Design a protein around this ligand. Structure first.
Ligand SMILES: C[NH+](C)c1c(Cc2cccc3ccccc23)cc(=O)n2c1SC[C@@H]2C(=O)O
Ligand SMILES: C[NH+](C)c1c(Cc2cccc3ccccc23)cc(=O)n2c1SC[C@H]2C(=O)O
Ligand SMILES: C[NH+](C)c1c(Cc2cccc3ccccc23)cc(=O)n2c1SC[C@H]2C(=O)O
Lengths: 230, 236
């Protein structure tokens, strides 16, 4: 991603320095009264919300390079009480106070447009995800998530599509009752298979059949990556 | 909405005239190759997508003032295949081509931030709605939409909180006796009816207990307080 490297070098040249985070660590939390703009350069993270009773809830996965903002760019107040947890072994992120961003982007429109499109990709991602759930319920969601993992971390192999994620990260993503009924169909219809410490997805058309709008979304958002396995 | 007004005259100054749309008109369709930035200034609209079977899907409702963009501002490629239909009897929207938008935002960054914020509000809206659904399922979704409709179109009258919205508009949002409902949905609205949530009085819709809606949709209430605090403070 060229636009991300240009943004990376733009932050370093403006004083903001990278920071390393390890698994289970929170780049920001739902109680911090200071809102930030996170430029997750590398690593996989997880947006969570904790109910006042202690319930944990996952709300979105992010991978670098990408931007995650916990405050509004103008009012600088919270967009919502969330945490950003690192899910992978480690991750690199440029923490930026929400106030320092308005200047960093006011001095450069190319990077301003770059941050803008990250939001648009979330909006269009959400609409596609709400669509596939409206048609296939939880089946469309599960298939949707697998579909994206296959496009991003899948490599063509003579025996399926090798998901290049360590088994620990795969388990952190979800690998009850109706869920048991779903994953059984996936293991039955030759969708996903576990072979020699590696995950392989073979019936990709099954994932596309039940997550259609998400397949469209990834085609228009990451066309280069989409064409590799299509 | 101050930023909306400021953004309106700014568009008119640069030669962008308002355009009127009637109910059932499409501000744009999925097959239009031109990417747009719809600045809906007044009215109500829905974003729709067509499935393979041909079944239309309601994905999102919009009200002015608000922004809806069909192309990525950087690559200028489409974000998806959507239609934008009018729901109210009339609607005012400033249609702007993707290229002409970058020229406008590059001149004045104040409006860039306004549009930037509108997307942020939409991003956190979905996360909150999904959060309420994960906690309360369909019940959270129903109370969520009713909660927002109350904060936006609700006026605290002696007879409760009146939802200032035409009956035919409410009918287009799925609020009318005789609509095709699911068994589970039927039992939810039945309880909402019994416990006085939405009532049909003087042919107008009122909201008796606001606490019930707030209880089973807390994340949307949290969202609306952070996104639209001025409107949230009215009924609190
Ligand atoms: C909110 N949305 C992005 C969404 C959806 C779509 C969705 C489902 C049900 C109700 C919704 C209401 C509003 C907006 C989106 C909704 C599904 C999903 O599984 N996940 C998400 S976030 C992460 C989670 C997932 O991938 O499992
Ligand atoms: C933030 N969302 C919208 C997202 C995702 C989410 C996602 C879905 C399913 C599995 C994931 C695993 C790790 C990280 C994110 C995941 C993916 C994605 O590729 N992009 C995006 S934005 C564009 C694209 C990208 O990272 O380039
Ligand atoms: C675009 N969404 C996120 C939305 C909506 C949509 C909406 C939700 C629930 C019921 C509706 C009924 C009619 C039209 C739109 C609805 C409303 C809203 O006020 N805001 C937003 S963003 C913040 C706020 C606003 O316009 O100020």
């Amino acid at each position: 991603n060229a636009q991300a490297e240009e943004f990376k070098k733009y932050l370093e040249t403006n004083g903001i320095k990278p920071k390393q985070f390890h698994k289970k660590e929170l780049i920001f939390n739902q109680w911090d009264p200071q809102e930030y703009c996170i430029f997750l350069y590398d690593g996989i993270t997880k947006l969570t919300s904790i109910s006042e009773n202690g319930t944990i809830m996952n709300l979105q996965y992010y991978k670098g390079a990408f931007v995650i903002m916990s405050g509004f760019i103008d009012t600088e107040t919270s967009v919502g009480y969330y945490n950003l947890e690192v899910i992978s072994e480690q991750a690199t992120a440029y923490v930026i106070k929400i106030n320092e961003l308005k200047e960093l982007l006011s001095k450069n429109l190319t990077h301003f447009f770059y941050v803008f499109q990250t939001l648009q990709k979330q909006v269009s991602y959400s609409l596609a995800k709400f669509n596939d759930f409206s048609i296939n319920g939880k089946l469309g969601s599960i298939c949707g998530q697998l579909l994206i993992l296959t496009y991003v971390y899948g490599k063509e192999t003579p025996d399926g599509i090798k998901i290049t994620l360590d088994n620990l990260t795969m388990q952190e993503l979800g690998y009850s009752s109706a869920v048991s009924r779903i994953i059984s169909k996936l293991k039955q219809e030759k969708v996903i298979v576990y072979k020699n410490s590696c995950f392989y997805v073979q019936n990709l058309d099954y994932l596309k059949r039940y997550a259609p709008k998400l397949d469209e979304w990834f085609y228009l958002a990451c066309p280069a990556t989409w064409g590799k396995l299509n």
